[PDB]
Design a protein around this ligand. Structure first.
Ligand code: NAG
Lengths: 49, 49
């Protein structure tokens, strides 16, 4: 799982990696993302692929 | 680094006065600060060490 947020001039990426016992959907259990990378770029994005 | 003696401490433009002793509590690599329940700067990470 990776969460990407762009605020106040710098791009941010947060990632937490966990193996899941059940294939269907996503685990109900709570897992908190730990920042892996923080990038200072002024880039703007209105689309992602 | 002086320990066990009250001394003025400045870390990255942050200044506080106290006795600095090693903290048993451990935190993840990304974190650079520790705080108390009163939103006070309870613990630090020496930048050099
Ligand atoms: C950033 O993106 C938004 C949405 O596309 C746009 O309105 C804005 O002009 C862009 N660039 C800057 C420098 O604000």
């Amino acid at each position: 799982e990776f969460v990407f947020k762009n605020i106040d001039g710098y791009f941010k990426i947060y990632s937490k990696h966990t193996p899941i016992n059940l294939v269907r959907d996503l685990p109900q259990g709570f897992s908190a993302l730990e920042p892996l990378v923080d990038l200072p770029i002024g880039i703007n994005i209105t689309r992602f692929q | 680094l002086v320990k066990n003696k009250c001394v003025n401490f400045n870390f990255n433009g942050l200044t506080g006065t106290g006795v600095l002793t090693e903290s048993n509590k451990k935190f993840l690599p990304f974190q650079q600060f520790g705080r108390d329940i009163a939103d006070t700067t309870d613990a630090v990470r020496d930048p050099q060490t």
